[PDB]
Amino acid sequence: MRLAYVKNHEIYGEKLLGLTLRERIEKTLQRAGFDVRFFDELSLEEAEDYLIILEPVLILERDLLLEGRKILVSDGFTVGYFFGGDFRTVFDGNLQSSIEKYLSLNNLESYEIWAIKLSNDNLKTAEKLLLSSLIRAAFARITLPLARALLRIGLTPDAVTIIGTTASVAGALVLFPMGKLFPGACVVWFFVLFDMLDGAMARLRSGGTRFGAVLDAACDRISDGAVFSGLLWWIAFGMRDRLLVVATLTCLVTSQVISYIKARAEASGLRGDGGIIERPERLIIVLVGAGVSDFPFIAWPPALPVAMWVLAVASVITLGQRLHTVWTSPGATDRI
Amino acid sequence: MRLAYVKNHEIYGEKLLGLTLRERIEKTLQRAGFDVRFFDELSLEEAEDYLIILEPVLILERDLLLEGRKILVSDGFTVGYFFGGDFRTVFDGNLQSSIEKYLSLNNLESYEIWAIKLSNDNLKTAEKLLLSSLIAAFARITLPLARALLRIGLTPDAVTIIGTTASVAGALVLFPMGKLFPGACVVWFFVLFDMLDGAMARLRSGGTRFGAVLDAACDRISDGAVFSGLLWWIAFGMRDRLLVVATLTCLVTSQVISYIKARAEASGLRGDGGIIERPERLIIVLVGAGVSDFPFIAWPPALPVAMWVLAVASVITLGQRLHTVWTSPGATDRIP
Numbered sequence: 203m204r205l206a207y208v209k210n211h212e213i214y215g216e217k218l219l220g221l222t223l224r225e226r227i228e229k230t231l232q233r234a235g236f237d238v239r240f241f242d243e244l245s246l247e248e249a250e251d252y253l254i255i256l257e258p259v260l261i262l263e264r265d266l267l268l269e270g271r272k273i274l275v276s277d278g279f280t281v282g283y284f285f286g287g288d289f290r291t292v293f294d295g296n297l298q299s300s301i302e303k304y305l306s307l308n309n310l311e312s313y314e315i316w317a318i319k320l321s322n323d324n325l326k327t328a329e330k331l332l333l334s335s336l337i338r339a340a341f342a343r344i345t346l347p348l349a350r351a352l353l354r355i356g357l358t359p360d361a362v363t364i365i366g367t368t369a370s371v372a373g374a375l376v377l378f379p380m381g382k383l384f385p386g387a388c389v390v391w392f393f394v395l396f397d398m399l400d401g402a403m404a405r406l407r408s409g410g411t412r413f414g415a416v417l418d419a420a421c422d423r424i425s426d427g428a429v430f431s432g433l434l435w436w437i438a439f440g441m442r443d444r445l446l447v448v449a450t451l452t453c454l455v456t457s458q459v460i461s462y463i464k465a466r467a468e469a470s471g472l473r474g475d476g477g478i479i480e481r482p483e484r485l486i487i488v489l490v491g492a493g494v495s496d497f498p499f500i501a502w503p504p505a506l507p508v509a510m511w512v513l514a515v516a517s518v519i520t521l522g523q524r525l526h527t528v529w530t531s532p533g534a535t536d537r538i
Numbered sequence: 539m540r541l542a543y544v545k546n547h548e549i550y551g552e553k554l555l556g557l558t559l560r561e562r563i564e565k566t567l568q569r570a571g572f573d574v575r576f577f578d579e580l581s582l583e584e585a586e587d588y589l590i591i592l593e594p595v596l597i598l599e600r601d602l603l604l605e606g607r608k609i610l611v612s613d614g615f616t617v618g619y620f621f622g623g624d625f626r627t628v629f630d631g632n633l634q635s636s637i638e639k640y641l642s643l644n645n646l647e648s649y650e651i652w653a654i655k656l657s658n659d660n661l662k663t664a665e666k667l668l669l670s671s672l673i674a675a676f677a678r679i680t681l682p683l684a685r686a687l688l689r690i691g692l693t694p695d696a697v698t699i700i701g702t703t704a705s706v707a708g709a710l711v712l713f714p715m716g717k718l719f720p721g722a723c724v725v726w727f728f729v730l731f732d733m734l735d736g737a738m739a740r741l742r743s744g745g746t747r748f749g750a751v752l753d754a755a756c757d758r759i760s761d762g763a764v765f766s767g768l769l770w771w772i773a774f775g776m777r778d779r780l781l782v783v784a785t786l787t788c789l790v791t792s793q794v795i796s797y798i799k800a801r802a803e804a805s806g807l808r809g810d811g812g813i814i815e816r817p818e819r820l821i822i823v824l825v826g827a828g829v830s831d832f833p834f835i836a837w838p839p840a841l842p843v844a845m846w847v848l849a850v851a852s853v854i855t856l857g858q859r860l861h862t863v864w865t866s867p868g869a870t871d872r873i874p
């Protein structure tokens with residue numbers, strides 16, 4: 203029983219891509235389980251949650267998971283508030299004063315919602331953004347507080363890159379050779395996410411650098427190499443499995459070369475992206491295989507070879523596919 | 539609207555250094571701003587200038603600066619005629635008589651062009667002269683090799699892939715068996731074989747960007763295969779684990795060293811340099827393995843010193859290139 207009180211605006215009457223923004227916001231809010239009430243003077247009906255939207259907005263995210271007590275924002279503009287039913291016990295009639303009292307009386311967090319504030323002179327951007335949205339949100343909502351905190355405590359994006367890469371190589375090269383595949387997989391995954399935090403951090407500094415991007419990518423390569431090298435050490439000298447080291451060497455080399463194809467193609471002004479296995483799928487397959495092979499109490503060892511062999515084949519295919527991208531890029535076959 | 543009318547000849551179908559003489563003269567004339575039309579009986583379309591080439595000819599000049607009314611010649615042989623559009627008002631159907639009437643009606647000048655008229659019994663001399671126009675031990679052994687490989691229908695990319703495949707096969711067949719000296723010899727030979735592809739591309743009046751990307755990716759696959767075969771032998775043949783950490787370092791760091799330069803150039807920065815580059819890498823490792831397995835005088839310590847040196851030299855290199863990326867223009871500028 204959640205109520206969504208939306209303040210009326212003349213711009214809601216405007217139609218965007220065949221539907222009125224008033225209908226568009228009504229449908230998005232309803233999809234999120236809200237009973238929608240457009241209002242001019244706020245009349246609070248008894249409910250468990252109150253989503254109060256005061257500024258005209260077009261919500262671009264399909265799944266709106268609202269919880270706690272939050273302040274909804276987008277691109278720095280405060281769009282609305284997510285209060286509890288206890289707000290009814292404070293609301294006296296003046297919405298500004300009631301909101302200020304509720305904010306002073308409670309602990310609230312900001313909630314970045316994928317949305318844009320509407321005006322008479324910005325509907326082209328709203329149409330473009332709705333089309334982009336129709337053709338991640340929670341990823342941003344969990345990433346931005348983390349990046350904010352890391353910046354506040356004095357860490358720079360490149361520093362976080364180095365820390366995540368160093369910690370991931372340390373976990374891979376200490377835990378994997380010892381046979382501790384499950385804790386190694388967990389530590390490596392944690393610090394791979396940590397390394398990926400630098401992009402959000404740089405976006406919060408009004409922009410990153412080209413060196414920072416090159417460093418992030420080279421560190422990705424060092425981290426992948428370390429994962430596969432620790433796994434290779436274990437498989438070769440711990441399990442004493444020669445076929446599986448053939449698969450591991452293939453995975454190592456082809457992952458390096460798969461990333462290198464895209465880098466070098468872009469260096470030549472061509473494209474080289476795509477493929478079945480990219481770095482996220484690569485890491486997931488190999489780390490899940492290792493973890494399942496060493497899972498506590500109910501370990502299934504054949505998960506390690508399977509993941510390794512599958513990946514290997516999927517890497518070889520990928521290496522070809524990316525080459526095809528390079529082949530099909532404009533200007534790739536010019537005699538220049 | 540300049541039209542070049544070239545009389546069709548059977549000889550134009552022959553290939554000289556990978557390209558047909560038809561395509562070669564077509565590209566040469568198009569570079570000079572002509573739309574090329576091959577003909578048997580002349581049917582004059584309205585145009586600004588007319589370049590009529592009746593005898594089968596190989597044009598050896600890159601830049602053709604044609605203006606006014608000229609008669610193209612070489613060594614006394616009449617190569618072509620450069621008339622104005624007014625020739626359209628004189629052409630009566632018989633091309634020889636029309637050409638003679640147009641010459642009688644105008645004052646023309648000779649234009650000495652570097653070209654050779656083709657016949658069935660002078661294509662060897664024509665190929666030699668084309669090679670001179672397009673172009674150490676490289677001249678006497680590499681260029682004949684490229685001419686030969688092109689003659690039998692092989693393309694530059696074909697030689698790239700074949701040389702890389704042969705080198706990978708040598709590395710992965712000979713090295714794991716402990717045949718380090720024969721492996722070093724085979725790998726060195728087929729590295730040179732792969733490097734023949736550049737001469738082949740230069741002889742086809744230009745390579746491609748895809749060809750360059752492929753050459754680089756194949757270099758990476760070759761490095762990976764060399765170090766993987768050596769790692770296999772060292773791990774299961776010599777059973778030397780310290781040397782396997784050194785070899786793993788060499789493998790990974792060679793891949794990442796190349797990736798750094800590629801990625802920096804993708805970002806518009808520089809990333810080259812370092813003490814140990816791919817030629818020095820190959821020389822050190824291939825010489826160390828060969829000396830360790832040399833017949834009569836095999837000296838085992840050459841493989842570990844070459845590897846450890848290499849390892850230490852690679853890590854440093856990886857740092858140096860990163861510093862290059864840091865110090866390139868615009869590397870640390872903020873991207874709004």
Ligand SMILES: CCCCCCCC/C=C/CCCCCCCC(=O)OC[C@H](O)CO
Nearest residue numbers: 448451452455710714715763766770774775
């Ligand atoms: C797409 C290109 C990928 C390129 C990278 C692929 C990496 C593959 C690694 C192969 C290891 C070689 C295995 C060779 C089998 C060795 C057989 C043998 O004779 O082993 C004897 C042993 O060393 C003493 O007991």
Ligand SMILES: Nc1ccn([C@@H]2O[C@H](COP(=O)(O)O)[C@@H](O)[C@H]2O)c(=O)n1
Nearest residue numbers: 694695733735736739745746749750753
């Ligand atoms: N497959 C191909 C096609 C063209 N090329 C050309 O040859 C150049 C390098 O020559 P080498 O292979 O002899 O080093 C490349 O940068 C490119 O211009 C090539 O190396 N391989």
Ligand SMILES: O=P([O-])([O-])O[C@H]1[C@@H](O)[C@H](O)[C@@H](O)[C@H](O)[C@@H]1O
Nearest residue numbers: 419422460461462464480481482
């Ligand atoms: O941005 P970047 O790191 O240069 O490019 C990388 C990513 O685009 C992709 O997600 C990853 O899976 C590939 O390995 C690729 O190399």
Ligand code: NA
Nearest residue numbers: 363397400418
């Ligand atoms: Na990063």
Ligand code: NA
Nearest residue numbers: 360411413414
């Ligand atoms: Na940076």
Ligand code: NA
Nearest residue numbers: 397418421422
């Ligand atoms: Na990274």
Ligand code: NA
Nearest residue numbers: 732753756757
């Ligand atoms: Na090559």
